[PDB]
Amino acid sequence: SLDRLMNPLIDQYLYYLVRTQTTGTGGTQTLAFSQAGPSSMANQARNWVPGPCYRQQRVST
Amino acid sequence: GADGVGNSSGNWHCDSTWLGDRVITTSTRTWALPTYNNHLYKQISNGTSGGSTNDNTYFGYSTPWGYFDFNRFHCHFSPRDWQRLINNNWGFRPKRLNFKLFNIQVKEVTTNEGTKTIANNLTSTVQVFTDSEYQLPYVLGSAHQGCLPPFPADVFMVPQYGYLTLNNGSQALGRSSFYCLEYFPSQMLRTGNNFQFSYTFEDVPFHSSYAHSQSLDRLMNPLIDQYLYYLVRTQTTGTGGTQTLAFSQAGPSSMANQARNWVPGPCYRQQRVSTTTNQNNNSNFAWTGAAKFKLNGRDSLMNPGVAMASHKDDDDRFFPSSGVLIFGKQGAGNDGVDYSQVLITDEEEIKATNPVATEEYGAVAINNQAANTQAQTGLVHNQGVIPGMVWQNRDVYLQGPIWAKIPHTDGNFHPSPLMGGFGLKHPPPQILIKNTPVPADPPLTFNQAKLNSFITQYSTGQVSVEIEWELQKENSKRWNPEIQYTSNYYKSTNVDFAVNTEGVYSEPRPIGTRYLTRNL
Amino acid sequence: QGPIWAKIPHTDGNFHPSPLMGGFGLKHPPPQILIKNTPVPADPPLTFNQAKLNSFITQYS
Ligand SMILES: Nc1ncnc2c1ncn2[C@H]1C[C@H](O)[C@@H](COP(=O)(O)O)O1
Ligand SMILES: Nc1ncnc2c1ncn2[C@H]1C[C@H](O)[C@@H](COP(=O)(O)O)O1
Ligand SMILES: [Cl-]
Ligand code: NA
């Protein structure tokens, strides 16, 4: 798949914004960054993105 | 002798040479290869079931092979060299390279009663081969760790090779393909044995090291007035309020009105976030807020997105949540690190031709104006390419990526890696290495089983990558001094891009490529 | 048991550049000869680590 173009074992040398707010009760804004890993595949940066689309109404057999 | 154990099977070349356009980089590092997966190909999948979401599902395999990656600029460039290149050229691109593996040594480690000893197995071998035909899933260009170290002195571990195949949940499909590296003609080595090859970069466009010194909108002479008119008023000024058509020639004062031949580049809206904590809304919108693209029923984050200006002037604190590259400060933690550790890159240089990441592209009319109905307009958050657009590609950094393999697809548009770099159809082939399994003594009576006992060993050696880059000198007639990357004079306790008191080279900030300015 | 030569500092100017400790003042003296034992890593951990190896076999030449 276009999304799954990277090695599972390795972790990207780049970070992404993982949280805007502290976990738990405090609820105070903070900036947390994590290196996209194998487990967090969706987060990690990619060089290519999917093709174009025009919405098509769905219908079931 | 030609190839013997008491003989250097190669030398150390770590030099940079500048002649004319051509700048040649040469690096050598000392690597170590662990045994991977106990000499076993393992099926690896992450399921829908359990804590993990559906968007993080995958199916693939982890191989007993390691791979050599040099796809990061800092590997071939000294910080000082990066400076010379950035500060005096309007562009550059890779032309050819040369790879070498040598002084291979294989060690066998023994442990008895808490006593550990490491000595040499000379008869032992190490397999190497290049995916010169591109038949193996392309790992590189995914920004994966494990590239040669930035500092020459450091000794590094070789990354483990593994790949992904089509999956539904934790299951594979009929289509999904399983590759066996061993089914590849690979060359074997014993110490005093060396491997090496050469590759030449397909022709690719020079990267832009120049930042525009004219906005796309401001492309016209102030003094003169356009011979064309625009609709300036729909209604008479003052009390009367009766519809009329008034036309004016766009002049110097009315710059915004005047017609233009070119329009800004494409944009995908990126949620804005402020470095200052207080300004941001008090919600965890890291994921919910962020723009994303849905493929095959799974939503993946739009990182790092299309190339767009990080911020409009004086909005320096602002950045796209996912729309810029981020580099950790040295020693930074992998998970949930504080803001201070990270180095957030800034792509404001390209603001002149590219849309701001956090703002709309502009506006379009939503309905026909009517005698009764009022005119309306809607914002454009998502804007695709149209005739007349011009734009700048995303920048590369001293510690950025270099190239990426263009997907073998029926079609694509402006295939320049979104993380920055050169898009190649046939990039530098993946180099695969592996320690040949050396079986532990077999049982005396034949067994149909496959041997599961092996001597424990790892290998080490030097590696050499030499790349020839073609420069493109500056031609500017700019009268005033241009901006340039410099190291501040003012004293400090540590030197920039040096080792600290402990022996830990560190890259204090990301270093862009565009300092020199060129006209539009 | 004295010194023999010394490298004349690369400066815009100087006077009678004979090493003050005695000897021959050379602009291009015998080049410094540098030697080093190549690091030989101790067995690496089985699962890839982004860290730089800190364990080496102890040896001298
Ligand atoms: N870095 C990189 N790699 C590969 N292909 C690229 C790159 N940058 C632009 N392109 C595309 C853009 C055009 O489709 C073509 C060159 O045409 P031109 O008229 O020269 O832009 O190649
Ligand atoms: N040992 C040594 N090394 C380098 N330069 C030296 C040395 N002794 C004298 N000099 C200087 C003195 C003069 O400037 C020049 C030779 O000129 P002359 O007229 O022959 O004295 O060299
Ligand atoms: Cl790091
Ligand atoms: Na595994």
TrEMBL record, chain C:
This is Capsid protein. It comes from the Viruses. Belongs to the parvoviridae capsid protein family. The gene is VP1. It is found in: Virion. The chain holds residues 615 to 675 of 736 of the full protein.
